[PDB]
Design an enzyme around this catalytic site. Sequence first.
Site, mmCIF file in Angstrom:
data_model
loop_
_atom_site.group_PDB
_atom_site.id
_atom_site.type_symbol
_atom_site.label_atom_id
_atom_site.label_comp_id
_atom_site.label_asym_id
_atom_site.label_seq_id
_atom_site.Cartn_x
_atom_site.Cartn_y
_atom_site.Cartn_z
ATOM 1 N N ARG A 23 0.801 -1.213 0.000
ATOM 2 C CA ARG A 23 0.000 0.000 0.000
ATOM 3 C C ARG A 23 0.816 1.236 0.000
ATOM 4 N NH1 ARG A 23 -1.511 0.995 4.194
ATOM 5 N NH2 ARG A 23 -0.875 -0.475 5.846
ATOM 6 N N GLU A 60 -0.036 -2.987 26.651
ATOM 7 C CA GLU A 60 -0.999 -3.146 25.584
ATOM 8 C C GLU A 60 -1.880 -4.394 25.787
ATOM 9 O OE1 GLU A 60 -0.907 -2.867 20.816
ATOM 10 O OE2 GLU A 60 0.055 -4.512 22.019
ATOM 11 N N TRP A 82 -0.504 3.525 20.107
ATOM 12 C CA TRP A 82 -1.796 3.805 19.417
ATOM 13 C C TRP A 82 -2.187 5.256 19.183
ATOM 14 C CZ3 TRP A 82 -4.667 -0.261 17.278
ATOM 15 C CH2 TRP A 82 -4.208 -1.519 17.621
ATOM 16 N N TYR A 146 -8.633 -4.369 19.534
ATOM 17 C CA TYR A 146 -8.739 -5.692 20.158
ATOM 18 C C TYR A 146 -9.571 -5.807 21.412
ATOM 19 C CZ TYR A 146 -5.524 -6.723 16.488
ATOM 20 O OH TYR A 146 -4.900 -6.751 15.269
ATOM 21 N N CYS A 198 -4.772 -7.126 12.264
ATOM 22 C CA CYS A 198 -3.774 -8.010 11.746
ATOM 23 C C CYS A 198 -3.887 -9.342 12.342
ATOM 24 C CB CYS A 198 -2.389 -7.480 11.985
ATOM 25 S SG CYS A 198 -2.089 -6.191 10.827
ATOM 26 N N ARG A 218 -2.929 -12.525 9.658
ATOM 27 C CA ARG A 218 -3.059 -12.215 8.216
ATOM 28 C C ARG A 218 -1.890 -11.516 7.532
ATOM 29 N NH1 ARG A 218 -4.005 -7.049 6.655
ATOM 30 N NH2 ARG A 218 -4.826 -5.552 8.196
ATOM 31 N N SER A 219 -1.254 -10.612 8.221
ATOM 32 C CA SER A 219 -0.243 -9.808 7.584
ATOM 33 C C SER A 219 0.810 -9.413 8.666
ATOM 34 C CB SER A 219 -0.929 -8.634 6.941
ATOM 35 O OG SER A 219 0.006 -7.651 6.680
ATOM 36 N N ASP A 221 4.812 -7.620 9.554
ATOM 37 C CA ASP A 221 6.048 -6.972 9.312
ATOM 38 C C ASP A 221 7.063 -7.721 10.116
ATOM 39 O OD1 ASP A 221 8.277 -5.216 10.011
ATOM 40 O OD2 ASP A 221 6.968 -3.634 9.029
HETATM 41 O O1 LIG Z 1 0.563 -6.056 15.311
HETATM 42 C C1 LIG Z 1 0.853 -5.710 14.157
HETATM 43 C C2 LIG Z 1 0.216 -4.608 13.540
HETATM 44 C C3 LIG Z 1 0.623 -4.292 12.220
HETATM 45 N N1 LIG Z 1 1.601 -5.008 11.515
HETATM 46 C C4 LIG Z 1 1.982 -4.623 10.132
HETATM 47 C C5 LIG Z 1 1.951 -5.708 9.062
HETATM 48 C C6 LIG Z 1 1.688 -4.934 7.751
HETATM 49 O O2 LIG Z 1 2.873 -4.466 7.108
HETATM 50 C C7 LIG Z 1 0.815 -3.806 8.233
HETATM 51 C C8 LIG Z 1 -0.694 -4.115 8.016
HETATM 52 O O3 LIG Z 1 -1.017 -3.453 6.781
HETATM 53 P P1 LIG Z 1 -2.204 -4.065 5.885
HETATM 54 O O4 LIG Z 1 -1.789 -5.527 6.145
HETATM 55 O O5 LIG Z 1 -3.577 -3.791 6.381
HETATM 56 O O6 LIG Z 1 -2.194 -3.618 4.516
HETATM 57 O O7 LIG Z 1 1.143 -3.625 9.611
HETATM 58 C C9 LIG Z 1 2.226 -6.093 12.146
HETATM 59 O O8 LIG Z 1 3.082 -6.765 11.578
HETATM 60 N N2 LIG Z 1 1.844 -6.452 13.449
#
Ligand SMILES: O=c1ccn([C@H]2C[C@H](O)[C@@H](COP(=O)(O)O)O2)c(=O)[nH]1
Lengths: 316, 316
Positions: A23, A60, A82, A146, A198, A218-219, A221
């Site tokens: 994104r 948290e 946050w 959450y 996430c 789901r996603s 970093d």
């Molecule tokens: O607890 C968390 C919160 C956010 N993200 C990261 C992963 C993604 O790069 C981004 C989520 O972006 P979208 O997946 O919605 O596009 O934030 C994490 O890894 N862990």
Amino acid sequence: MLEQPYLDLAKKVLDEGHFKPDRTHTGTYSIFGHQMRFDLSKGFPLLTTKKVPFGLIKSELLWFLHGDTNIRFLLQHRNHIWDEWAFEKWVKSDEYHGPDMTDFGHRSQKDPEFAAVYHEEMAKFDDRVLHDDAFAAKYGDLGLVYGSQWRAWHTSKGDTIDQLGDVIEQIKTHPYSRRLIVSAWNPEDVPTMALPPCHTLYQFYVNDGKLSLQLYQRSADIFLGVPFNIASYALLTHLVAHECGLEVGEFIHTFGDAHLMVNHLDQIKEQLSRTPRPAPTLQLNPDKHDIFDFDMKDIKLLNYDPYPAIKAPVAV
Amino acid sequence: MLEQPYLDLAKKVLDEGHFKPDRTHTGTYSIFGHQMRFDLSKGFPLLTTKKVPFGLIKSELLWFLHGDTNIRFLLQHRNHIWDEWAFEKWVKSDEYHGPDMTDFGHRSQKDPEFAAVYHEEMAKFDDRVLHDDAFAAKYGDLGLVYGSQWRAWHTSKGDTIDQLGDVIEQIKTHPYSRRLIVSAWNPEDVPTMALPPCHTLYQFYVNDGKLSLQLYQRSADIFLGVPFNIASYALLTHLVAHECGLEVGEFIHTFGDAHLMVNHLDQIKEQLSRTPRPAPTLQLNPDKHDIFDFDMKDIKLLNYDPYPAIKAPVAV
Ligand SMILES: O=c1ccn([C@H]2C[C@H](O)[C@@H](COP(=O)(O)O)O2)c(=O)[nH]1
Ligand SMILES: O=c1ccn([C@H]2C[C@H](O)[C@@H](COP(=O)(O)O)O2)c(=O)[nH]1
């Protein structure tokens, strides 16, 4: 050591992820579908190869556990994880008068100037929320976060379900239930949300008097998010295991799209240089059990000896 | 071959699952958190080491895809997978007069006698549903079943979301979305349901013009359920990939509590004797694309050469 799977997860993405645009068009190296296990009887997975702040992790989780959705609790513990979500609403609003802060996201990243006007109006917002009650109510409550998904899921018939408190009830009463699941993904809210969760869901499993937990994330970093996400769930796993009087078993961490920001390669490579040290130990107030009325002091970290922390620029 | 991961999943449970008691106190050997991948470019994962009926798989998926919740469509295709859930309601009801069929579940398992009175009143129920319209409406609609969770999720504000049709829209328009998720787990319905869904959720992923799919399956019967579940999702993955004009990539299958019924050990051991053959090929009506208006004939299986099927008693 015990962090190894975290490190294998990172190598795997370096020399195997394909480039995927994201994104915030930073782009990323991504793989899809991965799964690690940590055996929580061997120690608690707070990375040693780099300095993660436990305190932010603790505040948290407890915030989630009290079913709270209001920034104020966090600020009270010097936890700003946050703030931008709350402040964003301040900014996009009538009662707001001031330096337009349009996409201050980026515009505080390319501009030392602007980045002192923002890292500054913030300073007040936060103070306002701390001091003005009616302010906190209007601006510091986040709504769908959450805490409220776990502890007060809105029914279509206007009531609210305490999923998490319900599932723990069931863990004491039907340990073998294959249905011990908490979900944070609401399909009516999910289109109109700034950051649909996430951590989509989790499932408890009990056997031989041990509690396990698997998280569908789901996603991810890999560099910045995952070292934190792992500690929360592992902690969660322990608190629950404490309250239900079980031993801790494993925390399993399943991913969907797990990725590296394309500009984190140096940092994550530096890290792979380091050699894990033995893991810290978790320790719980043996007197208190109701985990909902648990406080900072009731939970504590032993023998944490991490390598230095690693600055990385954050993706905008 | 391509089924191997299915076979490794079964060996793994044999010589590594601990005994876990379940609901129908048959008991089971269970592990928690597992993940397989099938590369759908290499062939379609219908097991060859044992005869799975594709036709039942097809009719059920299409039934889910039309957003249907009424048994009648299935019976029309000679698919009875869902009869006992519908008939159960007939039985537990006012307009019902007849041989009490209380827990006919078991009581048709220990009793050749009774099991001909049941496998018989069923015969009529099914016929009634086929012929009497108002009957089908009262008894053959199931309510909360994948079809209605995927295609008509009830909002608290009284409307209905078409999650699946929405996510496909997004796949054409934002292929890189990390948010392409369909959920079947509703926390308000989930306490009051006969069988809260096994296939809790799934997530699509697109990259290099290939579509992938990962399924979070809370609870799996390795012998009986999983060989079917794998084919549905793989099929689903293809249909979606067809409609969005992408290539098929992988189907990933993540499990929570994956288990063997304790009385399936012989059977599953017999099966492990066999040697996979090359996988069948899937083939789609190159003319039709709207997958919602897809019919039996539009989808077809090439080169399927399975070992004999394997009778196993079913858990009550
Ligand atoms: O607890 C968390 C919160 C956010 N993200 C990261 C992963 C993604 O790069 C981004 C989520 O972006 P979208 O997946 O919605 O596009 O934030 C994490 O890894 N862990
Ligand atoms: O598509 C399906 C439907 C059902 N089951 C099996 C798995 C479990 O043994 C049982 C679900 O029972 P509970 O998990 O709700 O207790 O059904 C499957 O494996 N696949």
